[PDB]
């Protein structure tokens, strides 16, 4: 998620904002921006990032 | 693994991504780049790195 002024929402790979999660995350996989601390392109990781790594594989397998 | 743009996949020693694991992992051991946090060279560690150390030796023994 980006932290710039007026962009407290998730950013897409095309520098487009995600207003409502329930309408997009279901359609298909998405591409996001790179995480960096530069003031022009600042973005911090999210709450549940990196945690759900093994579960995806286990479930796809099952 | 590499986390740069459009590179949501692994990365070897020779800067070459991978699509389907099953195609190369079996043939011969491979070496990958070192973990790093640079904005240019962003490499993170894998999900299952480290865990499987013992059973390898146990099997080589048997």
């Amino acid at each position: 998620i980006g932290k710039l002024a007026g962009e407290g929402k998730p950013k897409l790979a095309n520098e487009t904002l995600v207003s409502d999660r329930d309408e997009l995350y279901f359609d298909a996989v998405q591409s996001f921006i790179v995480a960096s601390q530069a003031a022009a392109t600042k973005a911090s990781n999210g709450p549940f990032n990196g945690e759900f790594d093994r579960m995806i594989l286990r479930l796809h397998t099952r | 693994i590499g986390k740069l743009a459009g590179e949501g996949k692994p990365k070897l020693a020779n800067e070459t991504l991978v699509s389907d694991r099953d195609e190369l992992y079996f043939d011969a051991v491979q070496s990958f780049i070192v973990a790093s946090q640079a904005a240019a060279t962003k490499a993170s560690n894998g999900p299952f790195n480290g865990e499987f150390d013992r059973m390898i030796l146990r099997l080589h023994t048997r």
Partner: protein
Amino acid sequence: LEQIFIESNEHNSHNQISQFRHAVVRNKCKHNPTLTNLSFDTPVYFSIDEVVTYLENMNNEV
């Protein structure tokens, strides 16, 4: 060999055990070259002092 020297403590041993074995293997290969296909448990000679020297050179690696 993993009981006489390395006590069970300090579970954070992923690196330690791996590099230990990787050191013993090479020290064995050096002083007994005539043979082939050596291993961890293969009974050939090795200088534990040299193992110490190597581990130290690693401890201060720059």
